[PDB]
């Protein structure tokens, strides 16, 4: 019998890094899951599962919520079973899931003279990454027999790169903030149900 934590996460200065997603669990509370759909402040909204206006009778028990900031034109790579040459190397999602992803503008706060350079993203560490797993590999990419070990030789380049955006953002390449929720129903007691 308490207010849900949904109001303590939205409208935050920062959430996490590009290659760092934090999983959170919703505490016991009572609320309606159709409030987000009624809101007109989320222009972008895409997902799979029951319709927003009907997913109320079947109360969820398990909630997995993540939030991050990415490039605006990455919506093409946010889809189930994606086989993009870059997406799988950083993020991957399976087709057997029921959940919804929303995105909105991120330039309202991440704007200043000289652009933004705090965000970093990886390119390649060893091979394609399976979904639901992360690793921190500091080893430099190897493209030959002699181990460069940080030497700028044999195509040994730094795998991580930072964003760059001018305050005069034009085309939709400007960064966006993306939040993804997944709901799982089980016979175990449900934290939220009514």
């Amino acid at each position: 019998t308490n207010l849900c934590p949904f109001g303590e996460v939205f409208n935050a200065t920062r959430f996490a890094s590009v290659y760092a997603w934090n999983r959170k669990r919703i505490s016991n509370c009572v609320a309606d899951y159709s409030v987000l759909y009624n809101s007109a402040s989320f222009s972008t909204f895409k997902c799979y599962g029951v319709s927003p206006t009907k997913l109320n009778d079947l109360c969820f028990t398990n909630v997995y919520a993540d939030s991050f900031v990415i490039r605006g034109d990455e919506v093409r790579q946010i889809a189930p079973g994606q086989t993009g040459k870059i997406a799988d190397y950083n993020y991957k999602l399976p087709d057997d899931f029921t959940g919804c992803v929303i995105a909105w503008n991120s330039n309202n706060l991440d704007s200043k003279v000289g652009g933004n350079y705090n965000y970093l993203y990886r390119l390649f560490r060893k091979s394609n990454l399976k979904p639901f797993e992360r690793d921190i590999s500091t080893e430099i990419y190897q493209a030959g027999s002699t181990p460069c070990n940080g030497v700028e030789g044999f195509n040994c380049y730094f795998p991580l790169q930072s964003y760059g955006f001018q305050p005069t953002n034009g085309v939709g390449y400007q960064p966006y903030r993306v939040v993804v929720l997944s709901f799982e129903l089980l016979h175990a007691p449900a934290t939220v149900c009514g």
Epitope: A20, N22, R25, R134
Partner: nanobody, 123 residues
């Protein structure tokens, strides 16, 4: 949270002093689990100084930190106060000062206002 990492000091350093370390995390009761990551130990070799992750998590034995060095980590008040050990002159006493943040995933690390790793210092 402090970037400077150092260990305790016995009479060898002119007197007995309390440990100087801080624990970084969202809350003191973030989680009840035992684990660790690289957490570069004193010297070139890197070992798990302490896998407790909270107040008396679980005893862990490592070559870098053997029975000669106390194995305990406390996240209360983001500070360390437990005495390490009564060593003998002509020795080294350096202890890592860091802690994990709050997150369900493994290898938790503070994001937003923290940088990977910390400065290496000795007493």
């Amino acid at each position: 949270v402090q970037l400077v990492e150092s260990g305790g000091g016995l009479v060898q350093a002119g007197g007995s002093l309390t440990l100087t370390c801080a624990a970084s995390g969202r809350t003191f009761s973030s989680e009840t689990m035992d684990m660790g990551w690289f957490r570069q130990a004193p010297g070139k070799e890197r070992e798990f100084v302490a896998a407790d992750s909270w107040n008396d998590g679980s005893t862990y034995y490592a070559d870098s930190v053997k029975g000669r060095f106390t194995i305990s980590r406390d996240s209360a008040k983001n500070t360390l106060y437990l005495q390490m050990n009564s060593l003998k002159p002509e020795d080294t006493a350096v202890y890592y000062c860091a802690a994990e943040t709050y997150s369900i995933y493994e290898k938790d690390d503070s994001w937003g206002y923290w940088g990977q790793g910390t400065q290496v210092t000795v007493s």
